[PDB]
Short mmCIF file of C-alpha atoms and ligand atoms in Angstrom, two decimals:
data_model
loop_
_atom_site.label_atom_id
_atom_site.label_comp_id
_atom_site.label_asym_id
_atom_site.label_seq_id
_atom_site.Cartn_x
_atom_site.Cartn_y
_atom_site.Cartn_z
CA UNK I 1 -13.92 -22.58 -72.17
CA UNK I 2 -14.41 -18.94 -71.19
CA UNK I 3 -16.21 -19.89 -67.97
CA UNK I 4 -13.41 -22.22 -66.83
CA UNK I 5 -10.71 -19.63 -67.54
CA UNK I 6 -12.40 -16.86 -65.53
CA UNK I 7 -12.26 -18.84 -62.29
CA UNK I 8 -8.60 -19.74 -62.84
CA UNK I 9 -7.55 -16.19 -63.74
CA UNK I 10 -8.97 -14.62 -60.56
CA UNK I 11 -7.09 -17.06 -58.34
CA UNK I 12 -3.88 -16.64 -60.35
CA UNK I 13 -4.14 -12.85 -60.11
CA UNK I 14 -4.55 -13.19 -56.34
CA UNK I 15 -1.24 -15.07 -55.99
CA UNK I 16 0.67 -12.12 -57.46
CA UNK I 17 -1.42 -9.87 -55.22
CA UNK I 18 -0.69 -12.17 -52.27
CA UNK I 19 2.99 -11.23 -52.46
CA UNK I 20 1.84 -7.58 -52.30
CA UNK I 21 -0.80 -8.30 -49.62
CA UNK I 22 -0.17 -9.19 -45.98
CA UNK I 23 -2.32 -11.66 -44.04
CA UNK I 24 -2.43 -12.44 -40.32
CA UNK I 25 -4.90 -14.81 -38.65
CA UNK I 26 -4.91 -15.53 -34.87
CA UNK I 27 -7.34 -18.16 -33.50
CA UNK I 28 -8.35 -17.67 -29.84
CA UNK I 29 -4.76 -17.73 -28.56
CA UNK I 30 -5.47 -15.25 -25.71
CA UNK I 31 -3.99 -12.44 -27.84
CA UNK I 32 -7.47 -11.14 -28.73
CA UNK I 33 -7.77 -9.03 -25.57
CA UNK I 34 -4.56 -7.09 -26.24
CA UNK I 35 -5.16 -6.52 -29.96
CA UNK I 36 -8.89 -5.77 -29.81
CA UNK I 37 -8.52 -3.32 -26.92
CA UNK I 38 -5.81 -1.56 -28.94
CA UNK I 39 -8.12 -1.40 -31.97
CA UNK I 40 -10.77 0.64 -30.15
CA UNK I 41 -8.15 2.85 -28.49
CA UNK I 42 -6.29 3.47 -31.76
CA UNK I 43 -9.31 4.14 -33.99
CA UNK I 44 -11.40 6.37 -31.67
CA UNK I 45 -14.03 6.43 -34.48
CA UNK I 46 -15.80 3.08 -34.75
CA UNK I 47 -19.31 1.85 -35.46
CA UNK I 48 -19.67 -1.90 -34.93
CA UNK I 49 -18.77 -2.74 -31.30
CA UNK I 50 -19.65 -5.66 -29.00
CA UNK I 51 -20.14 -5.63 -25.23
CA UNK I 52 -18.30 -7.95 -22.82
CA UNK I 53 -19.46 -7.91 -19.19
CA UNK I 54 -17.15 -8.68 -16.25
CA UNK I 55 -18.88 -10.05 -13.13
CA UNK I 56 -16.36 -9.67 -10.28
CA UNK I 57 -18.72 -10.86 -7.54
CA UNK I 58 -16.40 -10.57 -4.56
CA UNK I 59 -17.60 -12.54 -1.55
CA UNK I 60 -18.90 -9.51 0.35
CA UNK I 61 -22.19 -8.73 -1.43
CA UNK I 62 -20.19 -6.26 -3.55
CA UNK I 63 -20.57 -6.75 -7.31
CA UNK I 64 -18.15 -4.78 -9.50
CA UNK I 65 -18.93 -4.56 -13.22
CA UNK I 66 -16.86 -2.73 -15.84
CA UNK I 67 -17.25 -2.79 -19.62
CA UNK I 68 -14.42 -3.50 -22.06
CA UNK I 69 -15.51 -2.65 -25.60
CA UNK I 70 -14.24 -4.42 -28.73
CA UNK I 71 -15.30 -4.43 -32.40
CA UNK I 72 -18.25 -6.65 -33.30
CA UNK I 73 -18.60 -9.14 -36.17
CA UNK I 74 -18.12 -7.47 -39.55
CA UNK I 75 -15.51 -5.55 -41.52
CA UNK I 76 -13.46 -2.47 -40.71
CA UNK I 77 -11.01 -0.12 -42.41
CA UNK I 78 -8.31 1.63 -40.37
CA UNK I 79 -5.70 4.33 -40.97
CA UNK I 80 -2.06 3.71 -40.04
CA UNK I 81 1.40 4.87 -41.11
CA UNK I 82 0.79 3.08 -44.41
CA UNK I 83 -2.25 3.14 -46.65
CA UNK I 84 -5.72 1.98 -45.57
CA UNK I 85 -5.85 -1.52 -44.07
CA UNK I 86 -8.77 -3.92 -44.60
CA UNK I 87 -9.78 -5.64 -41.34
CA UNK I 88 -12.39 -8.43 -41.37
CA UNK I 89 -13.66 -10.60 -38.50
CA UNK I 90 -15.74 -13.63 -39.52
CA UNK I 91 -17.42 -16.51 -37.68
CA UNK I 92 -17.62 -20.19 -38.67
CA UNK I 93 -20.02 -23.13 -38.37
CA UNK I 94 -17.58 -25.24 -36.35
CA UNK I 95 -17.69 -25.24 -32.55
CA UNK I 96 -15.14 -25.25 -29.75
CA UNK I 97 -15.72 -28.00 -27.18
CA UNK I 98 -12.90 -26.95 -24.83
CA UNK I 99 -14.42 -24.05 -22.89
CA UNK I 100 -17.88 -22.81 -23.79
CA UNK I 101 -19.31 -24.02 -27.11
CA UNK I 102 -18.51 -21.03 -29.33
CA UNK I 103 -17.90 -20.44 -33.05
CA UNK I 104 -14.26 -20.69 -34.02
CA UNK I 105 -13.13 -17.10 -34.69
CA UNK I 106 -10.50 -15.81 -37.12
CA UNK I 107 -9.53 -12.14 -37.58
CA UNK I 108 -7.78 -11.10 -40.80
CA UNK I 109 -5.71 -7.96 -41.38
CA UNK I 110 -5.13 -7.10 -45.05
CA UNK I 111 -2.68 -4.35 -46.04
CA UNK I 112 -1.49 -2.87 -49.33
CA UNK I 113 2.17 -2.41 -48.41
CA UNK I 114 4.84 -4.99 -49.18
CA UNK I 115 6.88 -4.47 -45.98
CA UNK I 116 6.31 -6.57 -42.86
CA UNK I 117 7.79 -3.90 -40.56
CA UNK I 118 4.29 -2.47 -40.06
CA UNK I 119 2.65 -5.25 -38.03
CA UNK I 120 5.83 -5.63 -35.95
CA UNK I 121 5.06 -2.21 -34.44
CA UNK I 122 1.35 -3.01 -34.01
CA UNK I 123 1.93 -6.28 -32.15
CA UNK I 124 4.54 -4.62 -29.92
CA UNK I 125 2.02 -1.96 -28.88
CA UNK I 126 -0.27 -4.76 -27.66
CA UNK I 127 2.42 -6.06 -25.28
CA UNK I 128 2.74 -2.65 -23.60
CA UNK I 129 -1.00 -2.53 -22.87
CA UNK I 130 -1.20 -5.90 -21.12
CA UNK I 131 1.79 -5.37 -18.82
CA UNK I 132 0.96 -1.76 -17.93
CA UNK I 133 -2.65 -2.62 -17.04
CA UNK I 134 -1.88 -5.54 -14.74
CA UNK I 135 0.23 -4.90 -11.64
CA UNK I 136 2.49 -7.47 -10.04
CA UNK I 137 1.87 -8.78 -6.53
CA UNK I 138 4.33 -10.35 -4.09
CA UNK I 139 3.33 -13.90 -3.10
CA UNK I 140 4.33 -14.91 0.44
CA UNK I 141 5.17 -18.52 1.32
CA UNK I 142 5.27 -20.07 4.79
CA UNK I 143 6.82 -23.42 5.68
CA UNK I 144 4.05 -25.77 6.82
CA UNK I 145 6.08 -28.65 8.21
CA UNK I 146 8.31 -29.93 5.40
CA UNK I 147 6.53 -28.11 2.54
CA UNK I 148 5.69 -24.54 1.51
CA UNK I 149 2.18 -23.12 1.24
CA UNK I 150 0.76 -19.73 0.33
CA UNK I 151 0.04 -17.43 3.28
CA UNK I 152 -2.90 -15.11 2.68
CA UNK I 153 -3.45 -13.14 -0.49
CA UNK I 154 -0.68 -11.80 -2.75
CA UNK I 155 0.49 -8.72 -0.90
CA UNK I 156 0.60 -5.33 -2.58
CA UNK I 157 4.20 -4.35 -3.28
CA UNK I 158 5.52 -1.99 -0.63
CA UNK I 159 7.72 0.36 -2.72
CA UNK I 160 11.45 0.36 -2.02
CA UNK I 161 11.39 4.12 -1.37
CA UNK I 162 9.24 3.59 1.75
CA UNK I 163 12.08 2.06 3.79
CA UNK I 164 14.39 5.07 4.11
CA UNK I 165 17.94 4.06 5.05
CA UNK I 166 21.25 5.91 4.79
CA UNK I 167 22.32 7.26 1.41
CA UNK I 168 24.06 4.73 -0.81
CA UNK I 169 22.82 1.81 1.31
CA UNK I 170 19.72 1.12 -0.80
CA UNK I 171 21.55 1.64 -4.10
CA UNK I 172 24.47 -0.61 -3.16
CA UNK I 173 22.21 -3.58 -2.43
CA UNK I 174 20.10 -3.01 -5.57
CA UNK I 175 23.16 -3.00 -7.83
CA UNK I 176 24.50 -6.22 -6.29
CA UNK I 177 21.24 -8.18 -6.52
CA UNK I 178 20.32 -6.90 -10.00
CA UNK I 179 23.76 -8.05 -11.18
CA UNK I 180 23.09 -11.52 -9.74
CA UNK I 181 19.81 -12.15 -11.58
CA UNK I 182 21.10 -11.05 -15.00
CA UNK I 183 24.25 -13.26 -14.84
CA UNK I 184 23.28 -16.94 -14.51
CA UNK I 185 25.94 -18.01 -17.03
CA UNK I 186 28.94 -16.69 -15.06
CA UNK I 187 28.36 -19.27 -12.30
CA UNK I 188 27.79 -22.68 -13.89
CA UNK I 189 30.58 -22.27 -16.45
CA UNK I 190 33.01 -21.64 -13.56
CA UNK I 191 31.62 -24.39 -11.31
CA UNK I 192 30.42 -21.95 -8.63
CA UNK I 193 27.12 -22.79 -6.84
CA UNK I 194 24.48 -20.38 -8.16
CA UNK I 195 23.54 -19.00 -4.74
CA UNK I 196 23.85 -15.62 -3.00
CA UNK I 197 24.01 -14.84 0.72
CA UNK I 198 22.97 -11.61 2.44
CA UNK I 199 23.23 -10.45 6.05
CA UNK I 200 21.59 -7.39 7.61
CA UNK I 201 22.49 -6.56 11.21
CA UNK I 202 21.74 -3.71 13.58
CA UNK I 203 19.63 -2.65 16.57
CA UNK I 204 16.03 -3.89 16.73
CA UNK I 205 13.43 -2.00 14.74
CA UNK I 206 15.89 -0.43 12.28
CA UNK I 207 14.35 -1.87 9.09
CA UNK I 208 16.12 -5.16 8.44
CA UNK I 209 12.88 -7.11 7.92
CA UNK I 210 11.12 -4.05 6.46
CA UNK I 211 13.62 -3.56 3.62
CA UNK I 212 13.57 -7.20 2.47
CA UNK I 213 9.78 -7.04 2.06
CA UNK I 214 10.09 -4.12 -0.38
CA UNK I 215 13.13 -5.43 -2.28
CA UNK I 216 11.26 -8.41 -3.75
CA UNK I 217 8.51 -6.15 -5.11
CA UNK I 218 10.96 -4.01 -7.07
CA UNK I 219 12.70 -7.06 -8.57
CA UNK I 220 9.30 -8.67 -9.33
CA UNK I 221 10.19 -11.63 -7.09
CA UNK I 222 8.30 -13.55 -4.40
CA UNK I 223 9.26 -14.16 -0.75
CA UNK I 224 9.51 -17.36 1.32
CA UNK I 225 8.88 -16.44 4.94
CA UNK I 226 10.69 -18.67 7.43
CA UNK I 227 11.26 -17.79 11.09
CA UNK I 228 14.15 -19.37 13.01
CA UNK I 229 12.14 -19.63 16.24
CA UNK I 230 9.81 -22.49 15.24
CA UNK I 231 9.60 -25.62 17.38
CA UNK I 232 8.96 -28.22 14.65
CA UNK I 233 12.11 -27.18 12.72
CA UNK I 234 15.16 -29.46 12.75
CA UNK I 235 18.44 -29.85 10.84
CA UNK I 236 17.08 -32.12 8.10
CA UNK I 237 13.84 -30.13 7.86
CA UNK I 238 15.71 -27.01 6.70
CA UNK I 239 17.68 -28.82 3.98
CA UNK I 240 14.43 -29.92 2.33
CA UNK I 241 12.60 -26.58 2.57
CA UNK I 242 15.43 -24.77 0.79
CA UNK I 243 15.37 -27.41 -1.98
CA UNK I 244 11.63 -27.18 -2.77
CA UNK I 245 11.45 -23.40 -2.81
CA UNK I 246 9.56 -21.78 -5.73
CA UNK I 247 11.65 -20.28 -8.51
CA UNK I 248 12.07 -16.50 -8.50
CA UNK I 249 11.70 -16.27 -4.72
CA UNK I 250 13.65 -14.93 -1.75
CA UNK I 251 14.09 -16.82 1.52
CA UNK I 252 13.73 -14.66 4.62
CA UNK I 253 14.99 -15.42 8.13
CA UNK I 254 13.69 -13.41 11.09
CA UNK I 255 15.65 -12.81 14.30
CA UNK I 256 18.42 -15.35 13.85
CA UNK I 257 19.70 -14.40 17.31
CA UNK I 258 16.87 -16.44 18.90
CA UNK I 259 17.81 -19.77 17.26
CA UNK I 260 19.31 -25.96 15.53
CA UNK I 261 23.11 -26.23 15.73
CA UNK I 262 26.00 -24.52 13.97
CA UNK I 263 27.62 -27.67 12.55
CA UNK I 264 24.38 -28.90 10.98
CA UNK I 265 23.86 -25.47 9.39
CA UNK I 266 26.70 -25.90 6.87
CA UNK I 267 24.86 -28.06 4.33
CA UNK I 268 21.78 -25.87 4.80
CA UNK I 269 23.53 -22.63 3.83
CA UNK I 270 25.83 -23.99 1.09
CA UNK I 271 24.41 -27.37 0.09
CA UNK I 272 25.72 -29.03 -3.04
CA UNK I 273 22.49 -31.07 -3.30
CA UNK I 274 20.10 -28.13 -3.56
CA UNK I 275 18.14 -26.37 -6.29
CA UNK I 276 19.48 -23.46 -8.34
CA UNK I 277 18.41 -19.80 -8.35
CA UNK I 278 18.08 -19.58 -4.56
CA UNK I 279 18.49 -16.27 -2.70
CA UNK I 280 18.61 -16.31 1.11
CA UNK I 281 18.25 -13.31 3.42
CA UNK I 282 19.26 -13.15 7.08
CA UNK I 283 18.16 -10.64 9.73
CA UNK I 284 19.64 -10.58 13.23
CA UNK I 285 19.09 -7.92 15.89
CA UNK I 286 22.44 -8.81 17.54
CA UNK I 287 25.59 -9.36 15.45
CA UNK I 288 27.51 -10.20 18.66
CA UNK I 289 26.37 -13.87 18.52
CA UNK I 290 27.55 -15.00 15.06
CA UNK I 291 30.74 -16.93 14.28
CA UNK I 292 33.44 -15.08 12.28
CA UNK I 293 33.68 -18.14 10.03
CA UNK I 294 29.95 -17.84 9.27
CA UNK I 295 30.36 -14.60 7.29
CA UNK I 296 33.22 -15.58 4.95
CA UNK I 297 32.77 -15.61 1.17
CA UNK I 298 30.65 -18.58 0.12
CA UNK I 299 28.05 -18.29 2.91
CA UNK I 300 27.65 -14.48 3.14
CA UNK I 301 28.78 -12.37 0.17
CA UNK I 302 27.87 -8.94 1.60
CA UNK I 303 28.05 -7.59 5.15
CA UNK I 304 25.95 -4.47 5.75
CA UNK I 305 25.21 -2.38 8.84
CA UNK I 306 21.79 -0.86 9.55
CA UNK I 307 21.94 1.89 12.18
CA UNK I 308 19.66 4.49 13.72
CA UNK I 309 18.11 7.45 11.91
CA UNK I 310 20.60 9.95 10.51
CA UNK I 311 19.92 13.46 9.25
CA UNK I 312 19.20 11.98 5.81
CA UNK I 313 16.36 9.78 7.09
CA UNK I 314 14.68 12.55 9.12
CA UNK I 315 14.53 15.00 6.21
CA UNK I 316 13.05 12.40 3.86
CA UNK I 317 10.37 11.08 6.22
CA UNK I 318 9.19 14.65 6.74
CA UNK I 319 8.77 14.90 2.95
CA UNK I 320 6.97 11.55 2.87
CA UNK I 321 4.47 12.57 5.55
CA UNK I 322 4.13 16.14 4.18
CA UNK I 323 4.39 16.10 0.37
CA UNK I 324 4.06 19.06 -1.96
CA UNK I 325 5.91 21.34 0.47
CA UNK I 326 8.97 23.46 -0.20
CA UNK I 327 12.38 21.83 0.43
CA UNK I 328 13.15 24.50 3.04
CA UNK I 329 10.20 23.34 5.17
CA UNK I 330 11.90 19.91 5.44
CA UNK I 331 14.88 21.50 7.24
CA UNK I 332 13.20 23.23 10.19
CA UNK I 333 11.99 19.80 11.30
CA UNK I 334 15.35 18.02 10.97
CA UNK I 335 17.12 21.00 12.56
CA UNK I 336 15.30 20.83 15.90
CA UNK I 337 15.09 17.01 16.00
CA UNK I 338 18.85 16.44 16.22
CA UNK I 339 19.16 19.48 18.51
CA UNK I 340 16.44 18.18 20.89
CA UNK I 341 17.19 14.42 20.84
CA UNK I 342 20.46 12.55 21.33
CA UNK I 343 19.36 9.13 20.03
CA UNK I 344 16.20 8.18 18.11
CA UNK I 345 15.27 4.91 16.37
CA UNK I 346 13.29 4.66 13.10
CA UNK I 347 10.43 2.86 14.86
CA UNK I 348 9.88 5.97 17.00
CA UNK I 349 9.87 8.33 14.01
CA UNK I 350 7.12 6.30 12.33
CA UNK I 351 5.00 6.61 15.48
CA UNK I 352 5.68 10.27 16.24
CA UNK I 353 4.16 11.46 12.96
CA UNK I 354 0.97 9.58 13.89
CA UNK I 355 0.31 12.34 16.46
CA UNK I 356 0.28 15.12 13.82
CA UNK I 357 -1.55 13.60 10.86
CA UNK I 358 -2.02 16.26 8.16
CA UNK I 359 -0.33 18.83 10.46
CA UNK I 360 3.10 19.78 9.06
CA UNK I 361 3.82 22.85 11.22
CA UNK I 362 2.59 20.85 14.22
CA UNK I 363 5.40 18.30 13.91
CA UNK I 364 8.11 20.98 14.01
CA UNK I 365 6.76 22.89 17.03
CA UNK I 366 6.25 19.82 19.27
CA UNK I 367 9.54 17.96 19.00
CA UNK I 368 10.16 18.27 22.76
CA UNK I 369 7.56 15.55 23.41
CA UNK I 370 10.10 12.91 22.25
CA UNK I 371 12.12 13.20 25.49
CA UNK Q 1 19.28 -29.27 -12.45
CA UNK Q 2 21.09 -27.50 -15.27
CA UNK Q 3 23.95 -29.63 -16.59
CA UNK Q 4 27.27 -28.50 -15.11
CA UNK Q 5 29.75 -28.89 -18.02
CA UNK Q 6 32.47 -31.51 -17.65
CA UNK Q 7 35.19 -28.91 -18.33
CA UNK Q 8 34.28 -27.05 -15.13
CA UNK Q 9 35.69 -29.80 -12.89
CA UNK Q 10 39.40 -29.43 -13.73
CA UNK Q 11 41.50 -32.45 -12.73
CA UNK Q 12 44.92 -33.63 -13.90
CA UNK Q 13 45.54 -34.30 -17.58
CA UNK Q 14 44.55 -37.75 -18.83
CA UNK Q 15 42.44 -38.48 -15.74
CA UNK Q 16 39.10 -37.48 -17.29
CA UNK Q 17 39.74 -39.15 -20.66
CA UNK Q 18 40.60 -42.58 -19.24
CA UNK Q 19 37.38 -42.74 -17.21
CA UNK Q 20 35.30 -41.44 -20.14
CA UNK Q 21 36.77 -44.07 -22.47
CA UNK Q 22 36.17 -46.86 -19.95
CA UNK Q 23 32.58 -45.89 -19.14
CA UNK Q 24 31.72 -45.10 -22.77
CA UNK Q 25 33.07 -48.55 -23.58
CA UNK Q 26 30.66 -50.00 -21.01
CA UNK Q 27 27.56 -48.24 -22.36
CA UNK Q 28 28.45 -48.84 -26.02
CA UNK Q 29 29.23 -52.57 -25.46
CA UNK Q 30 26.26 -54.18 -23.68
CA UNK Q 31 26.68 -57.48 -25.56
CA UNK Q 32 30.10 -58.33 -24.10
CA UNK Q 33 28.64 -58.94 -20.62
CA UNK Q 34 25.33 -60.82 -20.86
CA UNK Q 35 26.56 -63.25 -23.53
CA UNK Q 36 29.18 -64.51 -21.05
CA UNK Q 37 26.83 -64.83 -18.07
CA UNK Q 38 28.59 -61.97 -16.24
CA UNK Q 39 26.39 -59.59 -14.17
CA UNK Q 40 25.98 -56.45 -16.28
CA UNK Q 41 27.55 -54.11 -13.74
CA UNK Q 42 30.69 -51.98 -13.57
CA UNK Q 43 32.55 -50.82 -10.47
CA UNK Q 44 34.42 -47.55 -10.00
CA UNK Q 45 36.39 -46.17 -7.05
CA UNK Q 46 37.65 -42.61 -6.58
CA UNK Q 47 39.83 -41.82 -3.56
CA UNK Q 48 41.79 -38.79 -2.43
CA UNK Q 49 41.80 -35.89 0.03
CA UNK Q 50 38.45 -34.27 0.89
CA UNK Q 51 37.12 -31.57 -1.40
CA UNK Q 52 39.17 -32.57 -4.46
CA UNK Q 53 36.21 -33.17 -6.80
CA UNK Q 54 35.14 -36.78 -6.43
CA UNK Q 55 31.48 -35.87 -5.93
CA UNK Q 56 31.87 -32.75 -8.09
CA UNK Q 57 33.07 -34.70 -11.14
CA UNK Q 58 30.30 -37.31 -10.88
CA UNK Q 59 27.72 -34.51 -11.02
CA UNK Q 60 29.12 -33.38 -14.38
CA UNK Q 61 29.93 -36.88 -15.68
CA UNK P 1 -4.69 -16.11 26.96
CA UNK P 2 -2.49 -13.48 28.62
CA UNK P 3 -2.10 -9.72 28.24
CA UNK P 4 1.59 -9.77 27.33
CA UNK P 5 1.06 -12.45 24.67
CA UNK P 6 -1.73 -10.38 23.09
CA UNK P 7 0.66 -7.81 21.58
CA UNK P 8 1.80 -9.86 18.58
CA UNK P 9 -1.77 -11.15 18.16
CA UNK P 10 -3.34 -7.72 17.56
CA UNK P 11 -0.66 -6.21 15.28
CA UNK P 12 1.15 -9.08 13.58
CA UNK P 13 3.88 -8.25 11.08
CA UNK P 14 3.07 -11.42 9.10
CA UNK P 15 -0.49 -10.41 8.23
CA UNK P 16 -2.39 -9.20 5.19
CA UNK P 17 -2.93 -5.59 4.14
CA UNK P 18 -6.23 -3.69 3.95
CA UNK P 19 -7.48 -5.14 7.24
CA UNK P 20 -10.12 -3.41 9.38
CA UNK P 21 -10.54 -4.64 12.97
CA UNK P 22 -13.30 -3.76 15.44
CA UNK P 23 -13.06 -4.12 19.22
CA UNK P 24 -15.91 -4.15 21.76
CA UNK P 25 -15.41 -4.13 25.55
CA UNK P 26 -18.11 -3.62 28.18
CA UNK P 27 -15.58 -2.71 30.93
CA UNK P 28 -12.79 -0.19 30.27
CA UNK P 29 -11.46 -0.44 33.85
CA UNK P 30 -9.13 -3.41 33.07
CA UNK P 31 -7.16 -2.28 29.99
CA UNK P 32 -3.72 -0.68 29.96
CA UNK P 33 -3.66 3.03 28.94
CA UNK P 34 -0.85 2.23 26.48
CA UNK P 35 -3.12 -0.29 24.71
CA UNK P 36 -5.34 2.43 23.18
CA UNK P 37 -2.69 4.63 21.55
CA UNK P 38 -2.67 5.37 17.80
CA UNK P 39 -1.58 2.30 15.87
CA UNK P 40 -3.79 -0.03 17.91
CA UNK P 41 -6.83 2.24 18.38
CA UNK P 42 -7.27 5.21 16.03
CA UNK P 43 -10.56 6.47 17.53
CA UNK P 44 -11.82 6.34 21.13
CA UNK P 45 -15.58 6.74 21.55
CA UNK P 46 -17.95 6.26 24.48
CA UNK P 47 -21.45 4.79 24.06
CA UNK P 48 -23.76 5.65 26.95
CA UNK P 49 -27.43 5.38 27.84
CA UNK P 50 -30.30 7.05 26.00
CA UNK P 51 -30.15 10.85 25.93
CA UNK P 52 -32.97 13.27 25.14
CA UNK P 53 -31.91 13.23 21.48
CA UNK P 54 -32.21 9.45 21.27
CA UNK P 55 -35.70 9.32 22.80
CA UNK P 56 -37.20 11.74 20.27
CA UNK P 57 -35.71 9.83 17.32
CA UNK P 58 -36.55 6.31 18.54
N1 ADP V 1 14.64 2.45 7.86
C1 ADP V 1 13.29 2.52 7.91
N2 ADP V 1 12.58 3.35 7.11
C2 ADP V 1 11.24 3.41 7.19
N3 ADP V 1 10.51 2.65 8.03
C3 ADP V 1 11.09 1.78 8.89
C4 ADP V 1 12.56 1.67 8.86
N4 ADP V 1 12.89 0.75 9.78
C5 ADP V 1 11.76 0.30 10.35
N5 ADP V 1 10.68 0.91 9.82
C6 ADP V 1 9.28 0.64 10.23
O1 ADP V 1 9.31 -0.15 11.42
C7 ADP V 1 8.29 -1.16 11.39
C8 ADP V 1 8.87 -2.53 11.80
O2 ADP V 1 10.26 -2.66 11.50
P1 ADP V 1 10.96 -4.12 11.56
O3 ADP V 1 11.15 -4.65 10.16
O4 ADP V 1 10.22 -4.96 12.58
O5 ADP V 1 12.43 -3.83 12.17
P2 ADP V 1 13.49 -5.04 12.35
O6 ADP V 1 13.03 -6.06 11.35
O7 ADP V 1 14.82 -4.39 12.01
O8 ADP V 1 13.36 -5.51 13.78
C9 ADP V 1 7.67 -1.12 10.00
O9 ADP V 1 6.32 -0.65 10.11
C10 ADP V 1 8.52 -0.16 9.19
O10 ADP V 1 7.77 0.67 8.29
N1 ADP V 2 38.63 -30.61 -9.50
C1 ADP V 2 37.78 -29.57 -9.31
N2 ADP V 2 37.57 -28.62 -10.24
C2 ADP V 2 36.72 -27.60 -10.02
N3 ADP V 2 36.00 -27.46 -8.88
C3 ADP V 2 36.10 -28.35 -7.86
C4 ADP V 2 37.02 -29.48 -8.04
N4 ADP V 2 36.96 -30.20 -6.92
C5 ADP V 2 36.07 -29.62 -6.08
N5 ADP V 2 35.56 -28.51 -6.65
C6 ADP V 2 34.57 -27.62 -5.98
O1 ADP V 2 34.47 -28.00 -4.60
C7 ADP V 2 33.12 -27.95 -4.13
C8 ADP V 2 32.75 -29.22 -3.35
O2 ADP V 2 33.50 -30.38 -3.74
P1 ADP V 2 33.06 -31.86 -3.26
O3 ADP V 2 32.39 -32.57 -4.42
O4 ADP V 2 32.33 -31.75 -1.95
O5 ADP V 2 34.46 -32.62 -2.98
P2 ADP V 2 34.51 -34.17 -2.54
O6 ADP V 2 33.21 -34.71 -3.06
O7 ADP V 2 35.74 -34.69 -3.25
O8 ADP V 2 34.58 -34.22 -1.02
C9 ADP V 2 32.25 -27.68 -5.36
O9 ADP V 2 31.67 -26.37 -5.22
C10 ADP V 2 33.17 -27.77 -6.57
O10 ADP V 2 32.92 -26.78 -7.59
MG1 MG V 3 13.24 -7.91 13.06
MG1 MG V 4 32.93 -36.23 -0.63
#
């Protein structure tokens, strides 16, 4: 009688405690890395730790190994905003057959408090770690016949501040394209095709193709490279390529002046039978070859001019090539440049500073060489 | 593709309801055809000026 | 292969980053002086016969 009651009473007492005790169990759902890394960082005073070895054997003979430390099998107690929390990690006799033949693993967090606001903060901290650590890369796509294929490795994002255009020109395009991504509902409800057109025109080597490379990295989007000088490209070939483009990508056109007919281009630009979430970019070194009816609303929603270097671009590039200097030092350069040169393109400013690497004063005193 | 709502294509009053009633009658009455030896097919024709919404409406229908 | 068509081949805009290229030519008397400017060649260096320093070390 007494023996039977004792077993029942303990379990019954636990149920009342269960309401006053929080329990969380994840099972190998790829959340372990975020949470466990946070545990070691948050505690800073830990005993039982396990070693995981990364073997990044790049195909060059170079082997890179770094150690990420996490708590080992056992029990732990941690200090948080609330009272002491009981953490236990235990292994089982069952086995996973998916990946590697390992014990199924469950981690339990036990807290005294009755509020579930606590773990909400803890889990959120884990999200910050994973996204800050990893860095996004821009994937480039090239049209191989009628399909798209990756071209080289994912490029490192060229920052948008590198391409230095006139003031208000970079901010005006960012506001327009950021408004487009965050409003997908405004289109379909009103029957408008969810597509956006952009045109950049100006002299050669001004930064039309440079800027579009950096814009996708800021918006965390990919790029679909497509030159309009290919020989195996036809009218029907372009309708397909724009319909099988990856989502969250930008289509780039290089040197449209050297192009295909105009009448067959209508369904390619604004095609009713095409996928959604498609952004197209156009770069032409000569605006004096396009039709006025090509740049109306519906095909091109923003006309923008890209000119030569102004006084704003010269002062900034001097601060890019010579950082940590006083603002006054970035005026003696721009003063004599406009006084010694009548016209200068951005491609020539990028090459002139290659003659005075790590030589600030040398760039100001030798501006006459640009004649 | 994401479903374009049927209210986006805005035609004259009573034009969308008569076609919806006729085509919903066709889908919801499959027994009326085959029992009589009639080929189980329905024909529809839309005509008008270009760019009025013939192909637009069918996308939402 | 031509000399004018070699410009886009050496420095191609549609190419990967972190790329190191090495060039070896046994006869410098056929290249254009504008081909060896910074951007295409960042270090010019001549490699001659054995000097007195090389004979002692070898
Ligand atoms: N406005 C600019 N600011 C900074 N760099 C520029 C700018 N415009 C061009 N460049 C530089 O010029 C080079 C090539 O430019 P490119 O994109 O070919 O010009 P375009 O596409 O207009 O013909 C790149 O290395 C880029 O860094
Ligand atoms: N009745 C309508 N209501 C709303 N939008 C329409 C209507 N008719 C046409 N459109 C718009 O016209 C564009 C193309 O129409 P389309 O289907 O090519 O006309 P049709 O097929 O009759 O030649 C679409 O972007 C669509 O939103
Ligand atoms: Mg260009
Ligand atoms: Mg039609």
